[PDB]
Design a protein around this ligand. Structure first.
Ligand SMILES: O=C1NCc2cc(C(F)(F)F)ccc2-c2cnc(NCc3c(F)ccc4occc34)n3cnc1c23
Length: 359
């Protein structure tokens, strides 16, 4: 069971909107996590007796930048960890976490970036979701924009979240238009676009790299939630998603026995497999997280309470809930992060505080 072993507060006193453990940290090295809030990203190291050691920050040159998301990857040639951050300026920054130098940046989105995700099998493929209603897929090895997921049949309002499935064959995205949309990236067109992005070297050719314009999702529903959908994650072939209605819904496209890879774009049905209710989390912009193995699910609420669900059960509706409270933790928990082994759970808050829970 989890016990709160420590807490701290960042000096900017602004909300912390993101937190991620580095699940690519090397064997024998202490566990490391990043936080994003105000116009900065900060790294910490977890030590014994609940110690959280402060390392170093990246502070944006723009005092008006607001980072909203961060994601870890590694350099595909050296294995060294890399950290990607983005927010209100709509600029993706690739940071060397050792020195906190910005090694490169990507511009493209017409507005703020709400979430970054790396492909589960390819460390170079980065997905960004934006307030400009689109998703973008980048190849950070050749610095190319592989594809833009948008158009009339794409999202009709700001995109808040997206997630890759287990093999990175498809993406589920969600946002302010109340919809959840599926985008297959294992199509002949998308597998070819990814192969071409790797073959692109602007020093060895005259052509610009041509980005795919994907204007039609492979599935779409507005039947799960009745407000902004601000967080989505795959749970095998099933989906976990939430709005600001005090619930995480577990669902799938089509009928109960329909295989996800047989689903057609015209599919009009969904199946609800369960719903995890909770309290006082009815404000926009609150994220839930799962651990590496997807044995657990965590979400914080707007008054500092943590909910943890044990997903190691036969069916999703049988998940077992644990609640974690501390008399000094009373600010909204925007995001949580589990260490790769789930031995540590970190919660980050609206008052710039960080809470460490050890198993
Ligand atoms: O218009 C905004 N303004 C900054 C802001 C301000 C507050 C306030 F309460 F502090 F005022 C709360 C949330 C946000 C915020 C927080 N987070 C995002 N995007 C990232 C995000 C999502 F896109 C979806 C769920 C999330 O859970 C926590 C962060 C998060 N925002 C995008 N635009 C805004 C946000």
């Amino acid at each position: 069971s989890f016990k709160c072993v420590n807490s701290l507060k960042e000096d900017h006193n602004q909300p912390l909107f993101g937190v991620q453990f580095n699940w690519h940290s090397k064997e024998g090295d202490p566990l490391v996590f990043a936080t994003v809030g105000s116009n900065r990203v900060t790294l910490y190291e977890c030590h014994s007796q609940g110690e959280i050691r402060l390392l170093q920050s990246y502070v944006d040159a723009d005092a008006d930048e607001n980072f909203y998301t961060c994601a870890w990857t590694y350099d595909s040639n050296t294995s060294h960890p890399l950290l990607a951050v983005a927010g209100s300026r709509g600029i993706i920054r690739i940071i060397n976490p050792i020195t906190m130098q910005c090694i490169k940046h990507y511009v493209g989105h017409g507005n703020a970036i709400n979430e970054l995700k790396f492909h589960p099998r390819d460390p170079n493929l980065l997905l960004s979701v934006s307030k400009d209603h689109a998703l973008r897929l980048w190849n950070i090895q050749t610095d190319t924009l592989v594809a833009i997921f948008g158009g009339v049949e794409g999202h009709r309002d700001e995109v808040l979240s997206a997630d890759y499935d287990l093999l990175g064959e498809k993406i589920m995205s969600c946002g302010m238009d109340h919809s959840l949309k599926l985008w297959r990236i294992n199509s002949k067109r998308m597998m070819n676009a990814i192969k071409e992005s790797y073959d692109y070297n602007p020093n060895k050719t005259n052509r610009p790299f041509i980005s795919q314009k994907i204007h039609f999702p492979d599935f779409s529903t507005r039947d799960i939630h009745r407000n902004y959908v601000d967080c989505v994650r795959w749970l095998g072939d099933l989906i976990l998603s939430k709005s600001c209605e005090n619930a995480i819904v577990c669902w799938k496209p089509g009928k109960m026995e329909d295989d996800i890879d047989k689903i057609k774009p015209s599919e009009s049905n969904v199946t609800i497999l369960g719903r995890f209710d909770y309290s006082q989390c009815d404000i926009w912009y609150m994220r839930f997280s799962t651990d590496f193995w997807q044995k657990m699910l965590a979400l914080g609420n707007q008054v500092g309470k943590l909910y943890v669900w044990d997903l190691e059960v036969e069916d999703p509706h049988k998940a077992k809930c644990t609640t974690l409270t501390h008399h000094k933790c009373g600010a909204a928990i925007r995001q949580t992060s589990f260490s790769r082994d789930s031995s540590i759970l970190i919660a980050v808050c609206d008052d710039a505080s960080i809470w460490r829970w050890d198993r």
